Design an enzyme around this catalytic site. Structure first.
Site, PDB file in Angstrom:
ATOM      1  N   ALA A 105      -8.118   0.319   3.369  1.00 29.98           N
ATOM      2  CA  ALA A 105      -8.562   0.851   2.118  1.00 29.98           C
ATOM      3  C   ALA A 105      -9.789   1.680   2.234  1.00 29.98           C
ATOM      4  O   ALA A 105      -9.873   2.733   1.616  1.00 29.98           O
ATOM      5  CB  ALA A 105      -8.863  -0.272   1.122  1.00 29.98           C
ATOM      6  N   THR A 121       0.834  -1.195   0.000  1.00 31.42           N
ATOM      7  CA  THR A 121       0.000   0.000   0.000  1.00 31.42           C
ATOM      8  C   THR A 121       0.869   1.245   0.000  1.00 31.42           C
ATOM      9  O   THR A 121       0.707   2.136   0.826  1.00 31.42           O
ATOM     10  CB  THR A 121      -0.946   0.013   1.210  1.00 31.42           C
ATOM     11  OG1 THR A 121      -1.767  -1.158   1.163  1.00 31.42           O
ATOM     12  CG2 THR A 121      -1.821   1.252   1.191  1.00 31.42           C
TER      13      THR A 121
END
EC number: 3.4.25.1
Lengths: 195, 184, 192, 214, 215, 209, 190, 214, 195, 237
Positions: free
Chosen positions: C49, C1
């Protein structure tokens, strides 16, 4: 002025005395006698507690609110203390909440005289929509209340009350017209006499 | 969860819904209430049985009776639907009900048999069996269904009469009938 | 990420890898981390997320209510600050992210952690792979940097991060916030 | 309601409170004297119908270990005012652990009577009441009135014909007088205008015992 | 609160009278584009000629002219912006003018303390193309084609009645407001005596610069 | 005098009376306590399955009291189990009716309604509730427009040993004499088993006949 | 509890197929359940994760889309659901809805839509997604034969079909009867 | 109770009354000097026995000062709260918007009355901005404005005439039209980044004496 | 003087409710008739989609109509969600009476002066229900509200409408309306729709 | 119900609130009082309301600040209570004694709220504040019975405030007073305001606020000293 509970220029609540006049216009004529051994009441008989009763006198609808409040407080007494509320204490408390009607301009005096009877010896309390309570010895409240009070002042207990209503309303009764409630020394249980 | 009955069955008969259940309300290994009737009779026909903590059955018996009594003076699918709402709402606060109930009701030629899980899972199923028959009774129900895809008045009747022998034998045999609401 | 960002005399570049994961399964490799708020300033997504989307939707909303009412642009300082305040309230709730506000103002790069760590540097990499991304980053980074050299630097530093981080795979997604504002400078692949 | 029924007259007078002072003018006479053994408070009450009781609702209600009240004005209002006065006294005892100073209970109760001259939907309290107390080395004799104004006194009077009762109290009495001797002026000032009486001294608050009132 | 013996409420009809002391405002709808227009409403000369404002943005696609009680308008306007962004946040589509106007109508007569005096003219070009919803302070929105709101507006209404055109061109529709605003106004209209704002089918809402207004 | 909290000097609140007038306008309801059951008739609400109600006075307000009575019956069934007795139900709903009279802000009710219930212990009970919150038991009740005018014919009846079965026709008959008349009748007596229910349509058609 | 969902739309079809069975633990309770409830001639929504939540969630979705359909009197966009549903998942997130929902509404452009979700909200337009228990089994394979196709529909039906044959004999939570809901311009095609 | 219910006129009662209440206030002159802002007030009524919201924003209210401080306190809480939320300080315009929103609020409210002030909110951005705010909640930018008793005549005095020179304007309006007062006048120039800064009366004599020469 | 909602007339009833009836008359007319196949709203342009099978026609002030309607939608969803079936129309109309009830019984709160025609398709066969500005509502074979409805009612004593189906109903609904035509149809075959 | 409400927050068509004007007039019924600042201390004379024989206004807000209450008594107590609370809350968290100017602004905020909203009667009582805040030294403030406050060098309030304060306009020379001159002028003006030529000890009481040896102390004068000032007055006559 004479509409919201406030003092007149004479230092007099108008709505309160209007409530007394509403009690007189309730058209009923209650009397109670405190014998040594018994506490007759006669007229709307109520059983506020199994040991306490009272007769409201005035507006019919108005009676029931204070009956339920009397049962609320009477029951709540035993809940926090654990013995019958004295007749004095019950009349005191109901008087204290009838003053709330008077202190507050929002809500109005409930026109019902409240003649409590019950043994704490025997008790005959009065209560007014004023919030004033006092023990009488032989109360009467209603229409011919003053005409009865003389006959009370002149003065077997049941006889005192029944002859008082008979002489004072100047009418010979039928038994259904005179509801009668007795609380004998041996019978602290509120009980309608049933002459 | 406190004292708990189990073993509730349901399954349709063509124009009826047999629902049998034994009458034990055991608490622990002890069978404290070998007298509880777990099959409430909701409406002229429809009915719920319950298998889970019995306190929750009492709550939902009086509450489902509230909804029906209200609406009457103002269908099984609707009762299951709401029942899923009730079981779900109590799960959301993590204060569930432990009840797991079958709702058998003949509605307009259709035998709805809902099942409402305690944690709010919900479906209709023709041959429902709640706990302890949700591993045992269930193949006995199916084995008849594997062979014949529908069950007659007599088929589901005898199926449950034997399957309940497969708790204690004191079970009441409630039977929705084209009319509805029987109990034996 | 991984979501690097750095500013230099001809822009602020914000590159991001596109992998997203749950467990050791990879649900998708399609996400563009640099959630938009404004033509000329932009977000980031690091950490969980959903958090970044939601918070930056609230951010985009609040930046929009502000730009209408105040009748001026919201600044990188102000944007990061409202953001930092809003993520603080949910401190201890595990709403973890590493959003960054970037945009030309001079250029403004403010890293904004979820625990409320709104810090203004110039050079950042955020996420799991950041520790990889950092080491490459410093080695080419100078304020004296061309728009192209900077494009290569952002791509090398993301490429070296994704190469080691198990949970970061997917294509590099440059956005360049130059004087005028951002453009999708490259979306180009890592599997080249 | 939420709106106070107290509003200024064009020159700034609280009309409803002034009318409350008129309600004080009614009610049976009260009297109270600080003597030097202890204060006495006394009040007219009447048989009226000859069917009454006299121990039912004394105007003389003890509030705290050595404070008492006597009211003039409306009787119904007194019954609740006393309740809050006792509330303040017992609340004070659990927090501070000494029976509350006379001056302080009078002050706090005055604040209660002030609240309704500013508070919505309520009229001011009609009752005016002597609040007589003795702490430490001093007998305290106080007068709270309808606006929540209060004054300590050496001798004072309330109810019907207080106007002459105070006049007797400043000429028939002064300085100090042994407690029954300062009750002499009570029984003879009250005479200007059945009866309840209560005294303070330092012997626990007290109702002058009925055989000895006679 | 009191329904008059003649049906309709009092405060509302008094609020309608409050509009009469509000600025004249044409709300042109060309089927190309939107052309909200309003007299500057400036009277005082040292009061700023470019800081006074009458017409505000709501979204990038909806403009909002106002009339009546100018101060009161800004509460309903700000809440309209909050509603539209809330719609964007929940559904990612922009809130259409019919519902943007509806949400503001819902708040209009919620006095259980007093009604707003504002008339509003949302203009927003939404997928349908041009739309122009007038909003009465009676909590009634209505779709329009040409409605002019405010004080000399009744004469602007009747003037519009002859000149309203089937379809319409964007620039020609603008010229209609530029001519009618000279009539409704007491003074000779000047670009500092109007604040025009227009939305072409493709553009995002634009406050019109003054130089363009003289032509 | 016009506001409810105020008393008129003489001894009453005139607001309550103005609210009372509303039922003096609306047409006669007539319930009749009977050897079993109370046949409500009104030229009906299932307050409970146990209890029936026949409203008079403006209908709008009457439904709210019906719904409160349904609520009252349900809270009693839940908290106590057993189906509510009417002698207590009347008093509860009547108490709620009474509260309005006492405060300026809410208006007194327009309605007056005779709820009734057959039950095993009590037998038939027919209580009418005034908008003052004065409820009494009856042997017959008839309120509305033809208020004493109906009362003379229910006085003509002597239900005490009339069956419910005569009365289902007689209510409609009294309705016809005091009264075109839409007819409604109800049976709550032990044949109906305390299920509040409308008269069976053939007998109701016969009753109008 | 769980079970598999799958969806692909290229050309107009949004093929939302799923296994019927629900397992409370292992006790397959009904073998007749659909996961792909229809909502609108175009909207179809698979929901895997937790049935009890799936029910409640879809009723909340249906109620909310009807509220919209009153509030705007305009049909609920598929893109509106993608942005809306994520906020619905966030609304109950600190106690979360254990639900993986795939959206299939027919676009305004007459094309397929698929929107992957997770329990806290990650809407994803994509060409395909399988969610549920066997999703790990199905994604690489299904991706390989789908991800220069004109989205061939007949071969695509066989390609949707076969992978559930493969998942059913491999993963023990996919099985029984397969239900398919294509979404074409003619409507939902169950 | 709704207080500012609409008149049958279409006017609002309390609001128009508040418009006449600021007219009783003193002549709070202001002008947005091209260099810097300058503002001032007058009629202190010296018996001889006798604002700034930020380092940018400042205020020169007219009206009844009793209300005016009470408005400014809430305005100051709003300034500081904004400095913590956006990094930079509040702009003069945002202040004017809030004060105008705040004043509006009390008309649409239960039991409240409009704040009787009309504030000349003033402040640097570094370009001068000289707003008026009126009880209605209308706020308008100005370049000259003067609100107060006789201030209207001063605005007209400005209209026909519109560091030393901006101060000359601020003095001239008052020392020609309003009563000549070398102490009544309290003008305060605000320099660009120096906080609004009053002068000693002798420093004001730059024009208070030079006007005597003019 | 009965300019308050709470106050009752010595002469009779609350005047605000009566004035709310006149609030209905400034709104344009709307006509409701029905057959066993389809309910028929016809409105002289006001028809709204309350539900997938219920629609109201406002008359009077629009504001109260939207306030009642915003409630109607949420209430329709309540029955559709909690019990999983379409809301039966009659129950929702009973909720209208309950929500309209509060202002009439209370102070400082004005009545919902909108008169409504709640046509709906129903399982007992379609029904239409006028709701007056008081809570009171009426089951009815056919009805009209708004301006000049009295002419429209006069047409209906001679009117056939429970027999002839939706096309012919509407052909006659337009004829009734003559005594700018929105049409609201729902039936067993089709969902409520604004023709 | 609300039909009774006379509003008492209303704004009048003359443009000046009713209760505020009436509050000003309530004070005229209030008895005379005056405070006089000096460069070393601040005096506060006040007149005991009647001389009445058998009865046996200034208060301690702090030990460094004190108030005089003029307009009425019942309200005054609540004002003083709130003043003591504000001051001692400020002393609680900031841990320094409240500066006096602030304490006045706080109570005047509380007063102003009664006019502005709620439909409740305003406190009608004008106050003085004698004090010695740290930052300014000795100071005196007067609180109008609507929010205001004015730092005053000498002021009077109560009956004949106008004649008394006007008498001090010319009779209080600026910036010259040793405390001795404060006592002289105090005794003068209180003497001139009453119809009694000189005043008795049951009339004046003077709380002098004096910086007592680095610890500021308020002290009501001891009556023997009150009578030396009065006894000096008899010869000042």
């Amino acid at each position: 002025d004479r509409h919201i509970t406030i003092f007149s220029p004479e230092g007099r609540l108008y709505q309160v005395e209007y409530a007394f006049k509403a009690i007189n216009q309730g058209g009923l004529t209650s009397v109670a006698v405190r014998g040594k051994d018994c506490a007759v009441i006669v007229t709307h008989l109520f059983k506020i507690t199994e040991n306490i009763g009272c007769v409201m006198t005035g507006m019919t609808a108005d009676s029931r609110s204070q009956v339920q409040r009397a049962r609320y407080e009477a029951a709540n007494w035993k809940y926090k203390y654990g013995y019958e509320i004295p007749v004095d204490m019950l009349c005191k408390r109901i008087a204290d909440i009838s003053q709330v009607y008077t202190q507050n301009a929002e809500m109005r005096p409930l026109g019902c005289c409240m003649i409590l009877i019950g043994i704490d010896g025997p008790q005959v309390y009065k209560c007014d929509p004023a919030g004033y309570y006092c023990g009488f010895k032989a109360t009467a409240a209603g229409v011919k209340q003053t005409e009865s009070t003389s006959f009370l002042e002149k003065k077997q207990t049941v006889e005192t009350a029944i002859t008082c209503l008979s002489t004072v309303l100047s009418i010979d009764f039928k038994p259904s017209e005179i509801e009668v409630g007795v609380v004998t020394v041996e019978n602290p249980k509120f009980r309608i006499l049933t002459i | 969860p406190m004292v708990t009955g189990t073993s509730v069955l349901g399954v349709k008969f063509e124009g009826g819904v047999v629902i049998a259940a034994d009458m034990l309300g055991s608490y622990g290994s002890l069978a404290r209430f070998r007298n509880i009737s777990r099959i409430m009779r909701v409406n002229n026909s429809t009915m719920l049985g319950a298998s889970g903590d019995y306190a929750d059955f009492q709550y939902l018996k009086q509450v489902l009776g509230q909804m029906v009594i209200d609406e009457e003076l103002l269908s099984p699918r609707a009762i299951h639907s709401w029942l899923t709402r009730a079981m779900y709402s109590r799960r959301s606060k993590m204060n569930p009900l432990w009840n797991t109930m079958v709702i058998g009701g003949y509605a307009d030629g259709e035998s709805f048999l809902g099942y409402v899980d305690m944690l709010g899972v919900a479906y209709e199923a023709p041959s429902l069996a709640t706990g302890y028959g949700a591993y045992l009774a269930q193949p006995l129900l199916r084995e008849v269904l594997e062979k014949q895809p529908v069950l007659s008045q007599t088929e589901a009747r005898d199926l449950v009469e034997r399957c309940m022998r497969v708790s204690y034998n004191r079970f009441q045999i409630a039977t929705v009938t084209e009319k509805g609401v029987e109990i034996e | 990420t991984t979501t690097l960002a750095f500013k230099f005399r001809h822009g602020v570049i914000v590159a991001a890898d596109s992998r997203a994961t749950a467990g050791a399964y990879i649900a998708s490799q399609t996400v563009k981390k640099v959630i938009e708020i404004n033509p000329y300033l932009l977000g980031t997504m690091a950490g969980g997320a959903a958090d970044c989307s939601f918070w930056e939707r609230l951010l985009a909303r609040q930046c929009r209510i502000y730009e209408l009412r105040n009748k001026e642009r919201i600044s990188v300082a102000a944007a990061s600050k409202l953001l930092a305040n809003m993520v603080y309230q949910y401190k201890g709730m595990g709403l973890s992210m590493g959003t960054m506000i970037c945009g030309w103002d001079g250029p403004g790069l403010y890293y904004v952690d979820s625990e409320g760590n709104r810090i203004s540097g110039a050079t950042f990499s955020v996420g799991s792979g950041s520790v990889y991304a950092y080491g490459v980053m410093d080695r080419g980074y100078s304020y004296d940097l061309e728009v192209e050299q900077a494009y290569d630097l952002a791509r090398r530093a993301i490429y070296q991060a994704t190469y080691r981080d198990a949970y970061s795979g997917g294509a590099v997604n440059l956005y360049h916030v130059r004087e005028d504002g951002w453009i999708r400078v490259s979306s180009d692949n890592v599997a080249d | 309601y939420s709106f106070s029924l107290t509003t200024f007259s064009p020159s700034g007078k609280l009309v409803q409170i002034e009318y409350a002072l008129a309600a004080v003018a009614g009610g049976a006479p009260s009297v109270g004297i600080k003597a030097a053994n202890g204060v006495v408070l006394a009040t007219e009450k009447k048989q009226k119908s000859i069917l009454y009781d006299e121990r039912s609702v004394h105007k003389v209600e003890p509030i705290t270990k050595h404070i008492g009240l006597v009211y003039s004005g409306m009787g119904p209002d007194y019954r609740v005012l006393v309740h809050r006065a006792r509330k303040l006294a017992q609340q004070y005892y659990l927090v501070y652990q000494e029976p509350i100073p006379t001056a302080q209970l009078v002050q706090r109760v005055a604040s209660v009577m002030q609240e309704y001259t500013q508070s919505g939907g309520v009229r001011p309290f009609g009752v005016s009441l002597l609040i007589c107390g003795w702490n430490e080395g001093r007998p305290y004799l106080f007068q709270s009135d309808p606006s929540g104004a209060y004054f300590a006194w050496k001798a004072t009077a309330m109810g019907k014909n207080y106007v002459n009762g105070k006049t007797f109290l400043e000429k028939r009495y002064n300085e100090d007088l042994e407690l029954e001797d300062a009750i002499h002026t009570a029984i003879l000032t009250l005479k200007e205008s059945n009866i309840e009486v209560g005294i303070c001294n330092e012997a626990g608050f007290r109702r002058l015992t009925p055989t000895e009132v006679k | 609160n009191t329904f008059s013996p003649e049906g309709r409420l009092f405060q509302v009809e008094y609020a309608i009278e409050a509009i009469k002391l509000g600025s004249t405002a044409i709300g042109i709808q060309t089927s190309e584009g939107v052309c909200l227009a309003v007299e500057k409403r400036i009277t005082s000369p040292l009061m700023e000629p470019s800081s006074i404002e009458k017409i505000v943005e709501i979204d990038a696609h909806i403009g909002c002219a106002m009339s009546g009680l100018i101060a009161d308008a800004k509460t309903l306007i700000d809440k309209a912006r909050v509603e539209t962004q809330n719609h964007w946040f929940t559904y990612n589509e922009t809130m259409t003018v019919e519902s943007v106007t509806q949400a503001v109508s819902n708040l209009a007569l919620q006095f259980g303390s007093r009604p707003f005096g504002v008339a509003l003219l949302f203009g927003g070009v939404d997928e349908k193309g041009p739309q122009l919803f007038h909003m009465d302070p009676s909590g009634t929105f209505v779709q329009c084609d040409a409605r002019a709101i405010g004080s000399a507006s009744e004469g602007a209404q009747s003037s519009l009645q002859e000149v309203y055109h089937k379809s319409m061109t964007l620039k020609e529709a603008i010229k209609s407001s530029l001519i009618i605003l000279k009539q409704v106004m007491e003074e000779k209209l000047n670009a500092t005596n109007i604040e025009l704002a227009t939305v072409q089918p493709g553009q995002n809402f634009h406050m019109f610069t003054k130089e363009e207004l003289e032509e | 005098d016009l506001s409810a909290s105020t008393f008129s000097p003489d001894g009453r609140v005139f607001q309550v009376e103005y609210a009372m007038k509303a039922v003096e306008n609306s047409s006669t309801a007539i319930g009749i306590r009977c050897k079993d059951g109370v046949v409500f008739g009104v030229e009906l609400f299932n307050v409970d399955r146990h209890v029936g109600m026949a409203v008079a006075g403006l209908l709008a307000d009457a439904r709210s009291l019906a719904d409160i009575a349904r609520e009252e019956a349900s809270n009693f069934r839940s908290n106590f189990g057993y189906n509510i007795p009417l002698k207590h139900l009347a008093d509860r709903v009547a108490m709620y009716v009474h509260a309005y009279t006492l405060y300026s802000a809410v208006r007194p009710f327009g309605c007056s309604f005779m709820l009734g219930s057959y039950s095993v212990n009590d037998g038939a009970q027919l209580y009418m509730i005034d908008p003052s919150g004065v409820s009494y038991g009856y042997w017959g009740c008839a309120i509305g427009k033809a208020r004493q005018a109906a009362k003379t014919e229910i006085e003509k009846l002597q239900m005490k040993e009339m069956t419910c079965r005569d009365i289902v026709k007689e209510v409609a008959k009294i309705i016809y004499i005091v009264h075109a008349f839409e007819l409604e009748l109800s049976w709550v007596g032990e044949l109906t088993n305390g299920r509040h229910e409308i008269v069976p349509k053939d007998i109701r058609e016969e009753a109008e006949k | 509890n769980g079970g598999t969902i799958l969806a692909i739309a290229g050309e107009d079809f949004a093929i939302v197929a799923s296994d019927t069975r629900l397992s409370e633990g292992f006790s397959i309770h009904t073998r007749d359940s659909p996961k792909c409830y229809k909502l609108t001639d175009k909207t179809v929504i698979g929901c895997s994760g937790f049935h009890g939540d799936c029910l409640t969630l879809t009723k909340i979705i249906e109620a909310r889309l009807k509220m919209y359909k009153h509030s705007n009197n305009k049909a609920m966009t598929t893109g509106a659901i993608a942005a809306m549903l994520s906020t619905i998942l966030y609304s109950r997130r600190f106690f979360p809805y254990y639900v993986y929902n795939i959206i299939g509404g027919l676009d305004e452009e007459g094309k397929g839509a698929v929107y992957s979700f997770d329990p806290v909200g990650s809407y994803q337009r994509d060409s395909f997604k399988a969610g549920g228990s066997a999703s790990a089994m199905l994604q690489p394979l299904l991706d390989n034969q789908v991800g220069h196709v004109p989205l061939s529909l007949d071969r695509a039906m066989r390609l949707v079909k076969d992978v559930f044959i493969s998942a059913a004999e491999r993963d023990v939570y996919t099985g029984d009867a397969l239900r398919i809901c294509i979404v074409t311009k003619e409507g939902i095609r169950e | 109770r709704a207080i500012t219910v609409f008149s049958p006129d279409g006017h609002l009662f309390q609001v128009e009354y508040a418009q006449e209440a600021v007219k009783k206030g003193s002549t709070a002159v202001g002008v947005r000097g091209r260099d810097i802002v300058v503002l001032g007030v007058e009629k202190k009524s010296v018996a001889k026995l006798q604002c700034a919201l930020d380092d940018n924003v400042c205020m020169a209210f007219a009206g009844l000062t009793a209300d005016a401080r009470i408005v400014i306190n809430r305005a100051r809480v709003e300034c500081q709260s904004h400095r913590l939320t956006v990094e930079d300080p509040v702009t003069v315009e945002y202040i004017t918007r809030y004060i105008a929103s705040l004043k509006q609020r009390y008309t649409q409210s239960n039991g409240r009355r409009p704040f009787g002030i009309s504030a000349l909110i003033v402040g640097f951005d570094g370009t001068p901005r000289l707003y008026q705010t009126d009880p209605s909640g209308t706020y308008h930018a100005w370049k000259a404005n003067a609100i107060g008793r006789g201030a209207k005549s001063v605005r007209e005095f400005l209209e026909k005439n519109y560091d030393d020179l901006t101060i000359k304007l601020v003095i001239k309006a008052l020392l020609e039209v309003v009563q000549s007062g070398g102490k009544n006048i309290e003008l305060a120039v605000m320099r660009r980044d120096q906080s609004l800064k009053i002068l000693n009366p002798e420093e004001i004599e730059k024009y208070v004496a030079e006007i005597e020469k003019e | 003087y009965d300019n308050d909602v709470t106050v009752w007339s010595p002469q009779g009833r609350i005047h605000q409710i009566e004035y709310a009836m006149e609030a209905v008359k400034q709104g344009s007319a709307t006509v409701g008739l029905k057959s066993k196949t389809h309910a028929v709203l016809v409105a002289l342009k006001k028809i709204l989609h309350v539900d997938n099978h219920i629609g109201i026609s406002i008359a009077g002030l629009t504001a109260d109509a939207r306030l009642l309607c915003n409630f109607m939608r949420q209430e329709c969803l309540d029955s559709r969600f909690v019990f999983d079936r379409p809301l039966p129309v009659s129950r929702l109309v009973s909720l209208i009476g309950s929500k309209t009830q509060i202002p009439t019984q209370r102070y400082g709160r004005r009545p919902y002066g909108v008169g409504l025609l709640i046509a709906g398709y129903d399982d007992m066969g379609p029904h239409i229900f006028q709701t007056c500005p008081s809570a009171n509502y009426f089951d009815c074979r056919a009805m009209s509200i708004g301006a000049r409805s009295q002419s429209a009612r006069t047409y209906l004593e001679r009117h056939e409408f429970m027999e002839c189906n939706l096309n012919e109903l509407v052909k006659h609904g337009l004829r009734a309306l003559r005594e700018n035509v929105s049409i609201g149809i729902v039936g067993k075959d089709l969902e409520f729709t604004i023709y | 119900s609300r039909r009774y409400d006379s509003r008492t927050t209303i704004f009048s068509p003359e443009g000046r609130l009713y209760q505020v004007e009436y509050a000003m007039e309530a004070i005229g019924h209030a008895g005379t009082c005056l405070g006089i600042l000096a460069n070393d201390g601040v005096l506060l004379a006040a007149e005991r309301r009647n001389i009445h024989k058998l009865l046996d206004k200034i208060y301690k807000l702090n030990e460094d600040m004190a108030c005089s209450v003029a307009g009425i008594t019942s309200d005054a107590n609540v004002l003083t209570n709130e003043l003591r609370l504000i001051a001692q809350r400020y002393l609680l968290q900031y841990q320094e004694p409240i500066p006096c100017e602030q304490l006045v602004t706080a109570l005047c905020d509380i007063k102003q709220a009664y006019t502005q909203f709620g439909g409740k009667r305003p406190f009608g009582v004008s106050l003085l504040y004698i004090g010695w805040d740290k930052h300014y030294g000795f100071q005196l403030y007067q609180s109008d019975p609507s929010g205001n406050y004015g730092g005053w060098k000498a002021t009077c309030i109560g009956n004949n405030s106008a004649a008394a304060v006007s008498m001090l306009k010319q009779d209080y020379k600026e910036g010259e007073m040793t405390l001795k001159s404060a006592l002289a002028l105090a005794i003068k003006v209180l003497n001139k305001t009453m119809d009694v030529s000189k005043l008795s000890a049951e009339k004046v009481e003077i709380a002098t606020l004096t910086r007592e040896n680095g610890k500021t102390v308020i002290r009501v004068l001891k009556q023997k000293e009150v009578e030396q000032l009065i006894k000096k007055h008899e010869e000042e006559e």
